[PDB]
Amino acid sequence: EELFDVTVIGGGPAGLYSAFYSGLREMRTKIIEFHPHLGGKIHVYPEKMIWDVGGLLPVTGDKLIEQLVQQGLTFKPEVVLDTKVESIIRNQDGTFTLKTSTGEEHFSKTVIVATGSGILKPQKLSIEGAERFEVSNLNYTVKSLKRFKGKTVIISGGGNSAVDWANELEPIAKKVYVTYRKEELSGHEAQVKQLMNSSAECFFNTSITKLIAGDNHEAIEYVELTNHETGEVSHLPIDEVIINHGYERDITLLENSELDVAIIDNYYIAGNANSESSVDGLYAAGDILKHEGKLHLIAGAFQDAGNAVNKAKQFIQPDASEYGMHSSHNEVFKKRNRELIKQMMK
Amino acid sequence: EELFDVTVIGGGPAGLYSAFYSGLREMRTKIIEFHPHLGGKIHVYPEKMIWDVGGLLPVTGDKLIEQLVQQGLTFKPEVVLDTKVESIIRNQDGTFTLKTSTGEEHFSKTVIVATGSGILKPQKLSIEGAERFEVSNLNYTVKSLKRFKGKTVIISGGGNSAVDWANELEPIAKKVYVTYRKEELSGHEAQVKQLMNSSAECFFNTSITKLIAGDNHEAIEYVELTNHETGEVSHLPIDEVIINHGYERDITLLENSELDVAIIDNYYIAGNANSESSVDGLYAAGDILKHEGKLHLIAGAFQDAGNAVNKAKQFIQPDASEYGMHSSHNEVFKKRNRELIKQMMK
Numbered sequence: 228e229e230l231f232d233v234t235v236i237g238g239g240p241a242g243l244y245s246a247f248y249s250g251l252r253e254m255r256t257k258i259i260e261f262h263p264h265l266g267g268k269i270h271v272y273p274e275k276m277i278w279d280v281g282g283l284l285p286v287t288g289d290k291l292i293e294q295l296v297q298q299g300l301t302f303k304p305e306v307v308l309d310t311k312v313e314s315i316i317r318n319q320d321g322t323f324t325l326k327t328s329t330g331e332e333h334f335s336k337t338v339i340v341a342t343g344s345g346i347l348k349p350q351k352l353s354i355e356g357a358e359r360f361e362v363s364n365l366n367y368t369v370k371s372l373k374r375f376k377g378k379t380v381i382i383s384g385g386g387n388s389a390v391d392w393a394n395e396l397e398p399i400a401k402k403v404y405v406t407y408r409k410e411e412l413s414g415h416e417a418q419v420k421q422l423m424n425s426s427a428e429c430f431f432n433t434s435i436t437k438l439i440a441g442d443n444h445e446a447i448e449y450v451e452l453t454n455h456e457t458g459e460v461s462h463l464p465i466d467e468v469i470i471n472h473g474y475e476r477d478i479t480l481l482e483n484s485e486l487d488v489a490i491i492d493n494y495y496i497a498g499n500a501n502s503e504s505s506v507d508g509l510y511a512a513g514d515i516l517k518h519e520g521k522l523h524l525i526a527g528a529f530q531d532a533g534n535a536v537n538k539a540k541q542f543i544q545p546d547a548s549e550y551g552m553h554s555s556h557n558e559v560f561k562k563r564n565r566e567l568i569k570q571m572m573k
Numbered sequence: 574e575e576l577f578d579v580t581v582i583g584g585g586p587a588g589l590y591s592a593f594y595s596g597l598r599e600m601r602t603k604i605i606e607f608h609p610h611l612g613g614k615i616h617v618y619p620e621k622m623i624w625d626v627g628g629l630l631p632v633t634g635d636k637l638i639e640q641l642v643q644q645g646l647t648f649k650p651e652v653v654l655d656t657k658v659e660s661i662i663r664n665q666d667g668t669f670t671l672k673t674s675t676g677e678e679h680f681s682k683t684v685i686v687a688t689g690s691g692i693l694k695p696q697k698l699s700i701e702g703a704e705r706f707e708v709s710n711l712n713y714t715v716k717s718l719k720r721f722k723g724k725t726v727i728i729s730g731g732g733n734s735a736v737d738w739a740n741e742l743e744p745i746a747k748k749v750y751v752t753y754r755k756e757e758l759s760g761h762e763a764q765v766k767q768l769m770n771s772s773a774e775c776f777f778n779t780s781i782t783k784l785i786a787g788d789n790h791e792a793i794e795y796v797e798l799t800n801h802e803t804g805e806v807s808h809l810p811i812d813e814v815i816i817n818h819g820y821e822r823d824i825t826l827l828e829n830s831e832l833d834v835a836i837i838d839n840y841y842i843a844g845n846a847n848s849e850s851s852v853d854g855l856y857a858a859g860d861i862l863k864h865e866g867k868l869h870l871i872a873g874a875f876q877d878a879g880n881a882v883n884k885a886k887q888f889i890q891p892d893a894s895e896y897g898m899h900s901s902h903n904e905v906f907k908k909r910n911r912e913l914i915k916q917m918m919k
């Protein structure tokens with residue numbers, strides 16, 4: 228059949244390294260991700276420097292996502308993006324059937340749940356036809372600090388990530404505006420006092436009411452603002468717009484599944500130090516995995532993934548070795564290394 | 574006193590990441606390594622490509638040692654190189670005294686044992702004054718493939734690690750010689766048959782009996798060979814000499830200690846999923862740590878190290894958080910990020 232050895236639900240660090248290590252151990256591997264892009268929660272902070280991945284000199288999240296996606300695809304898994312896994316069923320023969328929000332079905336000998344803290348969607352701007360500018364200069368994350376160098380940015384919404392974004396764009400942007408719909412910027416008073424003594428201009432009881440494209444482009448050239456307590460309707464020229472109205476979560480995967488998988492605190496999968504859940508051949512890796520030695524770092528996701536994959540290989544092939552062969556000596560990389568070495572000699 | 578918070582014994586991946594994460598959590602950190610150079614077992618294979626470190630695109634061991642050492646020194650720990658720790662003593666107050674082969678003493682609130690598989694020294698060539706040529710062209714490891722491009726190398730010894738080197742130098746070197754003192758090349762018949770089908774010339778019952786330097790330099794220009802069954806004494810011009818007569822191990826650290834530490838299989842530290850040993854404030858990380866979920870990868874060294882450090886911080890400061898703050902938002906990196914961002918904006 229179309230029966231995979233290992234199917235990975237989720238495309239963040241845990242899922243990607245599962246796909247990678249599953250390929251290192253020569254299993255037919257699939258990875259299913261909700262978003263149209265792989266990478267996981269790091270898409271929430273692609274502009275920050277990341278210092279605590281073992282062996283990485285500091286990189287931005289954006290560059291880290293690049294490296295992880297490349298590593299996850301080394302063995303060319305079946306990649307199913309734009310797909311919400313809706314439920315997991317354990318068949319009587321012991322294999323698994325994954326049902327997507329479409330009803331489409333996937334089949335696997337083992338499943339590695341790497342859904343992290345779930346499906347995150349940024350809450351969209353409820354302005355008529357605002358999606359036109361998503362392809363240009365209407366953002367829901369700070370994709371990179373350089374993107375905003377010398378530009379004029381307005382941030383809609385307060386608190387959440389808003390105060391933190393403004394504080395890191397203040398020394399980079401030409402000007403930073405913040406518009407909040409309440410009275411006080413809903414952060415913690417530690418970082419809101421630096422925001423107000425510095426080069427950020429705040430508008431309270433205001434919201435964006437129309438995105439005005441250029442007569443020459445389709446980028447946002449001006450923005451219309453509206454006061455909720457006085458009533459004034461002003462216009463403002465900007466180079467970039469960033470929306471921060473929060474995130475929507477979807478964690479329904481395991482509730483919607485008929486599986487006696489043990490769950491901690493109504494969300495996390497109750498696992499052991501080897502990433503095993505209470506259902507045979509169903510493993511958890513990454514933020515979804517909870518056990519007494521779970522390390523709440525990206526570095527821990529790699530360990531969960533490797534432990535999960537190593538268990539899956541022996542579930543499928545009992546006489547398989549219990550540990551994967553070190554990459555430095557694994558012939559699985561012979562041809563790939565061949566070209567890399569040929570470039571190393573100039 | 575000179576009482577450190579965390580002292581790390583061993584400077585490989587586990588030790589290096591312990592020092593880093595110990596610095597991330599703002600503890601006075603020391604790291605002690607036997608060799609003149611940090612890096613650990615990766616120095617045994619600095620010429621190989623490493624694919625399975627989470628988030629690293631394939632890089633050589635040489636480059637990985639570079640990256641790990643830089644990360645391990647991020648917070649400028651006290652680095653004691655060229656130093657063998659001989660024993661660990663638990664003081665009455667619960668702190669620790671580490672005694673070096675000199676008798677010098679180090680003091681710590683916690684110890685993180687990251688000694689891997691022990692102190693490794695390559696078995697030296699027992700030829701009079703052969704160490705003169707170590708600084709020139711007599712090597713005991715393949716430091717890099719490019720070093721040997723288009724060169725003529727003689728490799729002494731015929732063990733399984735001898736055969737592996739020749740097979741990766743065959744398509745790079747101009748010519749490869751292999752000399753073994755026994756009758757049959759004591760590898761496994763899988764790669765020993767590949768050795769003989771190519772441009773590698775083997776000499777059996779042979780060993781080097783004198784190294785002949787250049788009259789103009791002091792590198793080895795010719796090498797003297799001797800047949801152990803015929804008796805011939807031939808001479809051979811070579812560019813590089815590589816000795817592979819095996820390694821000497823030193824694992825006496827935990828036998829020499831009067832410490833009630835639980836040891837598995839007469840070597841490993843018997844730990845839990847949080848890198849705790851049976852002695853309070855004494856942690857183990859990396860290849861020395863054994864427990865049911867230990868991952869035998871560099872990737873696992875990072876998890877062991879992080880879990881150990883997080884436990885040490887709470888051993889030293891009970892009210893400290895049990896998880897270290899994520900690097901992407903940790904003010905401890907403010908000044909360093911300041912400089913990096915200034916370079917990122919051109």
Ligand SMILES: Cc1cc2nc3c(=O)[nH]c(=O)nc-3n(C[C@H](O)[C@H](O)[C@H](O)COP(=O)(O)OP(=O)(O)OC[C@H]3O[C@@H](n4cnc5c(N)ncnc54)[C@H](O)[C@@H]3O)c2cc1C
Nearest residue numbers: 237239240241261267268312343345513514525899900901
């Ligand atoms: C703001 C912030 C900063 C951080 N900074 C650091 C740092 O500096 N260093 C560090 O080590 N860690 C950091 N972390 C932690 C790090 O983000 C997590 O450890 C890591 O992202 C967890 O990886 P994961 O793959 O387990 O989960 P995730 O990264 O959340 O990946 C889950 C993926 O699976 C998808 N998914 C979920 N449910 C489904 C479904 N039903 N069907 C299909 N796909 C689904 C999601 O869309 C997502 O793409 C930070 C976290 C946050 C929130």
Ligand SMILES: Cc1cc2nc3c(=O)[nH]c(=O)nc-3n(C[C@H](O)[C@H](O)[C@H](O)COP(=O)(O)OP(=O)(O)OC[C@H]3O[C@@H](n4cnc5c(N)ncnc54)[C@H](O)[C@@H]3O)c2cc1C
Nearest residue numbers: 553554555583585586587607613614658689691859860871
């Ligand atoms: C040939 C080979 C290839 C490998 N390839 C891979 C690969 O591709 N991927 C992968 O993930 N893993 C690989 N590994 C495994 C990897 O090398 C180990 O997982 C890793 O080195 C463990 O790190 P460590 O810091 O725990 O131990 P080590 O690397 O052994 O570090 C221990 C350090 O402590 C020092 N030390 C020991 N005793 C003392 C003492 N008493 N006083 C002071 N210092 C002391 C030692 O000199 C050494 O520097 C490979 C291993 C080998 C042997």
